[PDB]
Amino acid sequence: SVQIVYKPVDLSKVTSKCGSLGNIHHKPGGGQVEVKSEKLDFKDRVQSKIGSLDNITHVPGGGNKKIETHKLTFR
Amino acid sequence: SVQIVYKPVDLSKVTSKCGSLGNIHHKPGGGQVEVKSEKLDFKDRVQSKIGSLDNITHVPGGGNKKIETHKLTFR
Amino acid sequence: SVQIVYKPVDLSKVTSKCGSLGNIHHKPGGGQVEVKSEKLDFKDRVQSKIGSLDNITHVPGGGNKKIETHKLTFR
Amino acid sequence: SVQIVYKPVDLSKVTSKCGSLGNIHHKPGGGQVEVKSEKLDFKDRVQSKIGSLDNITHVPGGGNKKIETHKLTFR
Amino acid sequence: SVQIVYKPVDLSKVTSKCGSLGNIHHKPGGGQVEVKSEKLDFKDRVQSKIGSLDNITHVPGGGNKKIETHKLTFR
Amino acid sequence: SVQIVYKPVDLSKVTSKCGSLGNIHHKPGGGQVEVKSEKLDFKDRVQSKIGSLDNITHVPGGGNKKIETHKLTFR
Amino acid sequence: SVQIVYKPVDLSKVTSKCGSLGNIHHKPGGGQVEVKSEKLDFKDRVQSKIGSLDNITHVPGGGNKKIETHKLTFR
Amino acid sequence: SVQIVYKPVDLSKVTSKCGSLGNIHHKPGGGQVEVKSEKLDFKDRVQSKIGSLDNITHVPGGGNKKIETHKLTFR
Amino acid sequence: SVQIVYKPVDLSKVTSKCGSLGNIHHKPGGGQVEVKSEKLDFKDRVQSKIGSLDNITHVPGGGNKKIETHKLTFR
Amino acid sequence: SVQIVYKPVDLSKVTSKCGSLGNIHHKPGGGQVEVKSEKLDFKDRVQSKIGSLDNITHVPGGGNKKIETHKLTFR
Numbered sequence: 206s207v208q209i210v211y212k213p214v215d216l217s218k219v220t221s222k223c224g225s226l227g228n229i230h231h232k233p234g235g236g237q238v239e240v241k242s243e244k245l246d247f248k249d250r251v252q253s254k255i256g257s258l259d260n261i262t263h264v265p266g267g268g269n270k271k272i273e274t275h276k277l278t279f280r
Numbered sequence: 281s282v283q284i285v286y287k288p289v290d291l292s293k294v295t296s297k298c299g300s301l302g303n304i305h306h307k308p309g310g311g312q313v314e315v316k317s318e319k320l321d322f323k324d325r326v327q328s329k330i331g332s333l334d335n336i337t338h339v340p341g342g343g344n345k346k347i348e349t350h351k352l353t354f355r
Numbered sequence: 356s357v358q359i360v361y362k363p364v365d366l367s368k369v370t371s372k373c374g375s376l377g378n379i380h381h382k383p384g385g386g387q388v389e390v391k392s393e394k395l396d397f398k399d400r401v402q403s404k405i406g407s408l409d410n411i412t413h414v415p416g417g418g419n420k421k422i423e424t425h426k427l428t429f430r
Numbered sequence: 431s432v433q434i435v436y437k438p439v440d441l442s443k444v445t446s447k448c449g450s451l452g453n454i455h456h457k458p459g460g461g462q463v464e465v466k467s468e469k470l471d472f473k474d475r476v477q478s479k480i481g482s483l484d485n486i487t488h489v490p491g492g493g494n495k496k497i498e499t500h501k502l503t504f505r
Numbered sequence: 506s507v508q509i510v511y512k513p514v515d516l517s518k519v520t521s522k523c524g525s526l527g528n529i530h531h532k533p534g535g536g537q538v539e540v541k542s543e544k545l546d547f548k549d550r551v552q553s554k555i556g557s558l559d560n561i562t563h564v565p566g567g568g569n570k571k572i573e574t575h576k577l578t579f580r
Numbered sequence: 581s582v583q584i585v586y587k588p589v590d591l592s593k594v595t596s597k598c599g600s601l602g603n604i605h606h607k608p609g610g611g612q613v614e615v616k617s618e619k620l621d622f623k624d625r626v627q628s629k630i631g632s633l634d635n636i637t638h639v640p641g642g643g644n645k646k647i648e649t650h651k652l653t654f655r
Numbered sequence: 656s657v658q659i660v661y662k663p664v665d666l667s668k669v670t671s672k673c674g675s676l677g678n679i680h681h682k683p684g685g686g687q688v689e690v691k692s693e694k695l696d697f698k699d700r701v702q703s704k705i706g707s708l709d710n711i712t713h714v715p716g717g718g719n720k721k722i723e724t725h726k727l728t729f730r
Numbered sequence: 731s732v733q734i735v736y737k738p739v740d741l742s743k744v745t746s747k748c749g750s751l752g753n754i755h756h757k758p759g760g761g762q763v764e765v766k767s768e769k770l771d772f773k774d775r776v777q778s779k780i781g782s783l784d785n786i787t788h789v790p791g792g793g794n795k796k797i798e799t800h801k802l803t804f805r
Numbered sequence: 806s807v808q809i810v811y812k813p814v815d816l817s818k819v820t821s822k823c824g825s826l827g828n829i830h831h832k833p834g835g836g837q838v839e840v841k842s843e844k845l846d847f848k849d850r851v852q853s854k855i856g857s858l859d860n861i862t863h864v865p866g867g868g869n870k871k872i873e874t875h876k877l878t879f880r
Numbered sequence: 881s882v883q884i885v886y887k888p889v890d891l892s893k894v895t896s897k898c899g900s901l902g903n904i905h906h907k908p909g910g911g912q913v914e915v916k917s918e919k920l921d922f923k924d925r926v927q928s929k930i931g932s933l934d935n936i937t938h939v940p941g942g943g944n945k946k947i948e949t950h951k952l953t954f955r
Contacts, residue, residue: 206281206282206329206506206507206508207281207282207351208283208284208327208508208510209284209509209510210283210286210287210510210512210515211286211352211510211511211512211540212285212287212512212513213288213289213290213309213315213350213513213514213529214287214288214351214513214516215348215513215516215575216289216291216516216517217290217291217292217294217295217346217517218293218299218517218518218519218520219290219294219295219342219415219517219518219520220293220294220295220307220344220349220519220520220521220573221286221297221298221341221342221417221520221521221522221572222296222297222298222521222523223297223298223300223301223342223521223522223523223524224299224300224302224524224525224675224750224752224825224900225301225524225526225750225752225826225827225828225902226301226341226525226526226825226827227281227301227337227525227526227527227528227752227753227828227902227903228302228320228678228755228828229304229305229337229528230304230305230306230530230751231287231306231335231530231531231532232305232307232308232310232530232532232861233307233309233332233335233407233514233532233533233534234307234308234309234311234331234332234406234407234525234533234536234537234557235307235310235332235532235535235536236296236310237311237312237313237536237537237538237539238308238312238313238330238331238406238536238537238538239313239314239539240315240330240539240540240541241315241319241320241541241542242316242317242318242541243317243319243541243542244318244319244541244543244544245317245320245321245349245542245544246320246321246324246508246546246547247545247547247549248322248324248548249323249324249325249326249329249548249549250325250326251322251325251327251333251547252327252547252551253329253517253551253552253554253555254290254331254333254334254555254558255327255328255329255330255331255523255538255550255554255555255556256328256331256534256538256557256558257282257309257333257551257556257557257558257560258329258331258332258333258553258557258558258559258560259417259531259558259560260332260333260334260336260531260533260560261336261337261560261561261563262561262564263299263337263338263339263340263561263563263564264337264338264339264529264564265340265341265342265343265563265564266317266523266526266566266567266568267340267341267342267520267523267565267566267567267568267569268341268342268415268521268569268838269340269343269417269519269521269569269570270519270570270571271345271346271518271519271570271572272346272347272348272571272572272573273327273348273349273350273515273548273572273574274301274348274349274350274351274574275353275513275573275576276338276351276574276576276577277305277352277353277509277576277578277580277790278323278351278576278577278578279323279354279579280355281356281357282357282401282620283357284359284402285356285360285361286361286427287360287361287394288361288362288363288364288425289362289364289365290423291366292366292367292368292369292370292421293368293370294370294417294419294421295367295369295370295371295417295419296370296372296373296386296417296419296491297369297371297372297418297493298372298373298376298416298417298752299374299385299600299675299749299752299825300374300375300675300676300751300752300753301376301413301416301428301752302376302377302453302677302678302828303377303378303379303380303400303678303680303753304412304414305376305379305380305382306381306410306412307382307383307385308383308384308407308408308410309384309481309482310380310382311381311385311386311387311407311451312397312404312408313386313481314387314395314432315390315398315403316386316390317364317392317393317395318392318394319393319395320392320395320396320397321395321396321397322399322401323398324397324398324399324400324401325399325400325401326397326400326403327403328402328403328404329403329404329405329406329408330405330406330421330805331405331407331534332384332401332406332408332533333404333406333409335408335411336410336412338411338413338414338415339415340416340417340418341417341523341526342417342521342569343415343416343417343418344415344418344420345419345488346422347407347421347422347423348424348426349423349424349426350426351426351427352427352428353426353428353429354429356431356432358433358434359431359436359502359504360434360435360472361502362436362437363436363438363439363440364437364439364440365440365498365499366436366440367442367443367496368454368469369443369444369445369495370444370492370494370496371446371447371448371492372446372447372448372502373447373451373452373491374455374599374602374674374675374750375450375451375452375491375598375600375602375603375675375676375678375750375752376431376445376675376677377451377452377456377603377677377678377752378453378467378603378605378678379442379452379454379455379487379489379503380454380455380456380457380486381487382455382456382457382460382478382487383457383459383462383482384458384459384480384482385457385465385482386460386462387462387463388462388480388481389463389464389465390465391465391466392455392466392467392470393466393467393469394468394469394474395468396470396471397472397504398472398473398474399474399475400474400475400476401475401479403463403479403493404478404479404480404481404483405481406480406481407480407481407483408481408482408484409483409484410473410484411486411487412487412489413487413488413489413490414458414487414488414489415490415491415492415493416491417474417490417491418491418493419478419492419494419505420494420495420496421492421496421497422496423489423500424500424501425498425503426470426500426503427497427501427502427503428480428504429503430504433654449599449602450602450603450675452600452603452677452678453603453605467696478642507881519814522903524750524824524900525827525828525900525902525903526827526902527827528753528828528830528903528905581656581657581660582656582715582719584727584729585658585661585682586658586661587660587661587719588661588662588663588664589663589664589666589688590663591660591665591666591668592665592667592669593668593704594668594669594670594717594719595668595669595670595671595715595716595719596670596671596672596673596717596719596791596792597671597673598671598672598673598674598675598676599675599678599713599717600674600675600676601676601677601692601791602675602677602678603677603678603679603702603714604679604680604714605679605687606787607682607684608681608682608683608684608707608710609690610677610684610685611684611685611686611687611703611706612687613687613689613706613781614662614689615689615690615691616690616691616692617691617692617693617695618693619693619695620694620695620697621696621697622691622697622730623696623697623699624697624698624699624701624775625700626697626700626701627700627701627702627703629703629704629705630705630706631705631707632707632708633706633707633723634708635683635707635709635710636681637711637712638712638714638715639712639715640715640716640717641712641713642716642717643705643716643717643718643719643790644715644718644719644792645719645721646720646722647697647720647721647722648689648724649724649725649726650725650726651725651726651727651728652727652728653666653726653727653728653729655729656731656732658732658733659734660733660734660737660784661735661736661776661805662735662736662737663737663800664738664740665740665795666740666741666761667741667743667744667750667753668743668744668745669743669744669781669792669795670744670745670792670793670794671745671748671791671794671866671867672746672747672748673746673747673748673750673751673791674750675749675750675752676750676752676755676791676866677750677751677752677791678752678753679754679755679789680755680756680758681756681757681785682760683756683757683758683759683782683785683857684759685759685760686781686796687762687784688746688758688763688764688780688856689764690764690780691765691767691799692766692767692768692770693769694765694768694769694770695772695796696768696770696771697772697776698774699773699774699775699850701774701776702777702778703780704778704779704780704781704783705780705781706781706782707781707783708779708781708782708783708784709783709784710782710783710786711786711788712767712786712787713785713788713789713790714787714789714790715788715793716790716791716793717765717790717792718791718865719790719792719793719794719795720794721795721796721797722796722798723740723797723798723799723800724789724798724799724801725800725801726800726802727801727802728756728769728801728803728804729804730804731806731807732806732807733808734877734879735808735809735810735812737810737879738811738814738815739812739813739815739876740815740852741810741815742817742819743818743820743871744820744825744867744870744871745818745819745820745867746820746822746865746866746867746869746941747820747821747823747868748806748824748825749823749826749829749942750824750825751825751827751866751941752825753819753827753828754831754862754864756831756832756860756871756937757831757832757833757834757931758833758834758839758857758860759857760834760835760840761834761835761856761868762837762838762875763837763839763856764838764840764852764861765839765841766840766842767810767842767843768844769844769845769861770844770846771846772847772851773848773853774847774848774849774850774864775850777850777852778848778853778854779854779855779856779858780853780856781857782836782857782858783856783857783859784859785855785859785860786860786861786862786863787861788807788836788861788862788863788864789864789865789867790865790866790868791867792866793866793867794865794942795871796870796871796872796873797872797873798854798872798873798875799869799874799875799876800875800876801876801877802876802877802878803877804820804878804879805878805880806881807882808882808883809954810882810883810884810885810886810887812886813886813887813889813890813893814887814888814889814890814922815890815924815948816890816891817891817893817894817946818951819891819893819942819945819946820894820942820944821895821896821897821898821942821943821944822896822898823896823897823900823901824899824903824940825899825901825902826901826941827900827902828903829903829905829937829939830904830905831902831906831912831935832897832909833932834909835888835909835910835932835937836909836912836914836932837911838912838914838930838931839913839915839918840916840930842916842917842920843917843919844919844920845917845920845921845922846922847922848922848924848927849922849924849926851926851928852925852930852940854900854929854931854933855928855930855931856890856931857932858892858929858934859896859909859933860887860934860936860937861891861916861936861938862937863900863936863937863938863940864938864939864940865940865941865942865943866942867942868939868940868942868943869942869943869944869945870944870945870946871947871948872946872947872948873949873950874894874948875950875951876950876952876955877951877952877953878951878953879954880954880955
């Protein structure tokens with residue numbers, strides 16, 4: 206009675222070509238940071254951060270991506 | 281009675297070509313930061329951040345992307 | 356009785372070509388930041404940020420994108 | 431009784447070509463920022479930000495995009 | 506009565522080519538950080554961080570990715 | 581008695597081919613100069629120069645030279 | 656009696672081919688100079704230079720030279 | 731009596747081929763100079779230079795030279 | 806009586822091929838200089854140089870030389 | 881009586897092939913110099929140099945030389 210046929214075909218290509226990648230320079234919090242405090246009161250949770258935190262330099266030669274979902278559902 | 285046939289065909293291409301990529305320079309919080317406080321009162325949660333935080337330099341040679349959903353659903 | 360046939364064909368191309376990409380310069384919060392406070396009162400949650408935060412330099416050689424949905428649904 | 435046939439064909443191309451891309455310069459919050467406060471009262475949630483935040487330099491060599499939906503629905 | 510056939514075919518390729526990748530420089534918290542405190546009171550959990558923390562330099566030669574889900578579900 | 585004959589032939593070519601030439605940035609400049617002088621004596625001619633002088637940026641697309649001397653001399 | 660014959664032939668070629676040339680950055684510059692002088696004496700001509708002088712950035716696409724001398728001399 | 735014959739032939743080629751040339755950064759510069767002088771005496775000509783002088787950045791795409799002398803001499 | 810014949814032949818080639826040339830960084834520079842002088846005496850010509858002088862960055866894509874002398878001499 | 885014949889033949893080739901050339905970093909530089917002098921005497925010409933002088937970065941893609949002398953001499 207029923208025939209289902211699921212024949213997707215994919216010959217795709219995600220591509221990149223880069224002769225030369227360079228001279229990157231990241232210089233966060235190069236300056237001066239000063240914190241003075243007097244007579245502070247805290248009745249609840251404190252988080253502090255002070256300085257140069259969480260600084261990223263992310264230099265992929267590629268960095269190319271592909272996402273592909275397939276789904277076939279039946280009642 | 282029923283025939284379903286699902287034959288998508290994809291020969292696509294997401295492509296890039298870059299001779300030379302360079303001389304990038306990121307210089308956040310180069311200046312001076314000063315914080316003075318007197319007689320502060322807190323009855324609830326504090327989060328602080330002070331300085332140069334979360335600074336990103338993201339330099340993919342590629343950075344090319346493709347997303348493809350397929351779905352086939354039946355009652 | 357029923358025949359469904361789903362044969363999309365795609366030979367597309369998203370493409371770019373860039374001889375030379377450079378001399379980028381990002382210089383946030385280069386100046387001076389001063390915060391003085393006296394006799395502050397807080398009865399509820401505080402978030403602060405002070406300085407140079409969350410600054411991005413995003414330089415993809417490619418940066419090309421393609422999105423493609425396919426859906427075939429039946430009652 | 432019924433025949434449905436879904437044969438879209440796509441030979442499209444989204445394309446760009448750029449000899450040289452450069453000399454970009456982003457200089458936010460170069461000046462001076464001063465905040466003085468006396469006798470402030472807060473009965474509810476505070477968010478502050480002070481300085482140079484969230485500044486983006488986004489320089490894709492490509493930056494070309496294509497979106498394509500296909501849908502075929504039946505009762 | 507029922508025949509289901511699930512024959513997706515994939516000949517895809519996510520690719521990159523990079524002649525030379527270099528001269529990367531990450532210099533967070535190069536400046537000076539000073540914290541003075543007098544007469545602080547805490548009635549709840551404290552987290553502090555002070556200095557240069559969590560700074561990443563991530564330089565993959567490749568960095569190319571592919572994700573592919575397949576699902577076939579029946580009642 | 582004497583026969584002198586000078587028949588040089590030249591079919592040369594100096595050639596160049598450059599797709600794209602970009603992104604030069606020269607800064608012979610920015611800095612400070614101070615000169616203080618007390619009780620100086622000069623008994624012969626003086627030349628001075630003070631500041632940013634004679635600084636060049638020379639970006640020829642071609643920039644190809646060809647120099648050819650011919651000489652024929654008789655006594 | 657005498658026969659002199661000078662028949663040079665040249666079919667040479669000096670050639671160059673460069674897809675893309677980019678991203679130069681010269682900074683002969685930035686810094687500070689100070690000169691103080693007291694009770695100096697000069698009995699003959701003086702030349703001075705003080706600052707940023709005679710600094711070049713030379714970026715020819717071609718930049719190919721060819722030099723050819725010919726000489727024929729008789730006594 | 732005398733027969734002299736000079737028939738040089740040259741079909742040479744000086745050639746270069748460079749896909750992509752990038753990302754130069756010269757900094758002959760930044761630093762500090764100080765000169766103090768007291769009770770100096772000069773009885774003959776003086777030349778001085780002080781600062782950033784005669785500094786070159788030379789980036790030819792080709793940069794190919796060919797030099798050829800010919801000489802024919804008779805007494 | 807005398808017959809002299811000079812028939813050099815040259816079909817040479819000086820060649821180079823370089824896919825991608827990148828990422829140079831020269832810093833002849835940064836540092837401090839101080840010169841103090843008291844009670845010096847000069848009875849003949851003086852030359853001085855003080856700072857960053859005559860510093861080169863030479864990045865030819867080709868950079869191929871070929872030098873050829875010819876000489877024919879008779880007495 | 882005399883017959884002299886000079887028929888050199890050259891079909892040579894000086895060749896180079898380099899896929900990718902990268903990532904040079906020269907720092908002839910950074911450091912401190914101090915010179916103090918008291919009661920010096922010079923009765924003949926003086927030359928001085930003080931700082932960062934005559935420093936080279938030479939990165940030819942090719943950089944191939946070929947030198948050829950020819951000489952034919954008669955008395």
